[PDB]
């Protein structure tokens, strides 16, 4: 699976380059500041 950004926190876009290592291109929920973070999913607002 080539064509991606294996750079942790690698600026990426949902319509441009994805992440290699397996990061998730998370943005600022506004359409700006998109980046590929090292798979992060820590909830709690619903757990507590």
UniProtKB/Swiss-Prot annotation:
Tissues showing expression: Expressed by the venom gland.
Tell me where in or outside the cell this protein is found: Secreted
Task: Kindly give the Gene3D superfamilies that the UniProt entry links to this protein.
Answer: 4.10.40.10
Q: What is its main location?
A: secreted
- What do the Gene Ontology cellular component annotations say? extracellular region; host cell presynaptic membrane
Q: Name the Pfam families on file.
A: Toxin_9
Which keywords fit this entry according to its UniProt record? Answer: Calcium channel impairing toxin, Disulfide bond, Ion channel impairing toxin, Knottin, Neurotoxin, Presynaptic neurotoxin, Secreted, Toxin, Voltage-gated calcium channel impairing toxin
InterPro entries for the chain: Spidertoxin
Q: List the disulfide bonds.
A: 4-20, 12-25, 19-36, 27-34
Secreted recorded as keyword: yes
Molecular function via GO: calcium channel inhibitor activity; toxin activity
Q: Does the keyword 4Fe-4S apply?
A: no
Question: What other remark does the UniProt record contain for this protein?
Answer: This toxin is a diagnostic ligand for P-type channels Ca2.1/CACNA1A in the mammalian brain.
Q: What does this protein do?
A: Omega-agatoxins inhibit neuronal voltage-gated calcium channels. This toxin acts by modifying the gating of the high voltage activated P-type Cav2.1/CACNA1A channel. Is a potent blocker in both insect and mammalian central neurons.
Q: Which family does it belong to?
A: Belongs to the neurotoxin 02 (plectoxin) family. 03 (omega-agtx) subfamily.
Q: What's said on domains?
A: The presence of a 'disulfide through disulfide knot' structurally defines this protein as a knottin.
Name the UniProt record assigns to this protein: Omega-agatoxin-Aa4a
